[PDB]
Amino acid sequence: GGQIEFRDFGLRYRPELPLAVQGVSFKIHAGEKVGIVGRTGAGKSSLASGLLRLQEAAEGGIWIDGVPIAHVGLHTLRSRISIIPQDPILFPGSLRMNLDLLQEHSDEAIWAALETVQLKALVASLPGQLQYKCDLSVGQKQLLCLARALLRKTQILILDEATAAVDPGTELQMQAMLGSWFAQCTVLLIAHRLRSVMDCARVLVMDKGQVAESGSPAQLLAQKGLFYRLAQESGLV
Numbered sequence: 001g002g003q004i005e006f007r008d009f010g011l012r013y014r015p016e017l018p019l020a021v022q023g024v025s026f027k028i029h030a031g032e033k034v035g036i037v038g039r040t041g042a043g044k045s046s047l048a049s050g051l052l053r054l055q056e057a058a059e060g061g062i063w064i065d066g067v068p069i070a071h072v073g074l075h076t077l078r079s080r081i082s083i084i085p086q087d088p089i090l091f092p093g094s095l096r097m098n099l100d101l102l103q104e105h106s107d108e109a110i111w112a113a114l115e116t117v118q119l120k121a122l123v124a125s126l127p128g129q130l131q132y133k134c135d136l137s138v139g140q141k142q143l144l145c146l147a148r149a150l151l152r153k154t155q156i157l158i159l160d161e162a163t164a165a166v167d168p169g170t171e172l173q174m175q176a177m178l179g180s181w182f183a184q185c186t187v188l189l190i191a192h193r194l195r196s197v198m199d200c201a202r203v204l205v206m207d208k209g210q211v212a213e214s215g216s217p218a219q220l221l222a223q224k225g226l227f228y229r230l231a232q233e234s235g236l237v
Ligand SMILES: Nc1ncnc2c1ncn2[C@@H]1O[C@H](COP(=O)(O)OP(=O)(O)O)[C@@H](O)[C@H]1O
Pocket: 013, 014, 017, 019, 020, 021, 038, 039, 040, 041, 042, 043, 044, 045, 046, 047, 206, 209
């Protein structure tokens, strides 16, 4: 399904530190694409880090399809939950290994995923093709991550926006797929550019470790709240 629910959630990265994020309660419906916006330090990455249970729950809990992730095997928990970082690091070695470390797919199915993210041609161009070792641009590495997210049968796609200048063709293919191959996939897009979540149907606005406001960009723009302030600073409104 990919339906996530934070219920009064907070996490700390280390015992001695204060809660990085606290009292976060929200329900993401299965298959939804929700943008997550906020300033640096607001708590956007912590939500994904709480989902992946990188940091354990300090308060409340998270539930994925009615199952408390607190009671879900970590490998299981993380198997169909995929994250696309800003600057993905290829695991040193075979390209195929990066795409399929567990070797649970056939070269056939891997090439499909690549062609899905429109990297089949690039990969075919590569010196070792699938066996190509690691180069590829940050945008391409993200796409490769997207193809891997497909192979994983991912139902929760956490996407991290590149803080660096966005490749015009990567953005074109990335959006091209989010509504088609990840249509049924829940997509948490953690955005560092407010413009990127404007077409989103729903945005969580993170603020100093707490959910500040929720709803569509139009709703949040009308509220003239933190979301609205970020749009002004961004020059969108
Ligand atoms: N590795 C870390 N160790 C300790 N504190 C952290 C770490 N990463 C983030 N934080 C803190 O937790 C809070 C939440 O930030 P974060 O979740 O990273 O939001 P964002 O994704 O918007 O940067 C911030 O105050 C941040 O400084």
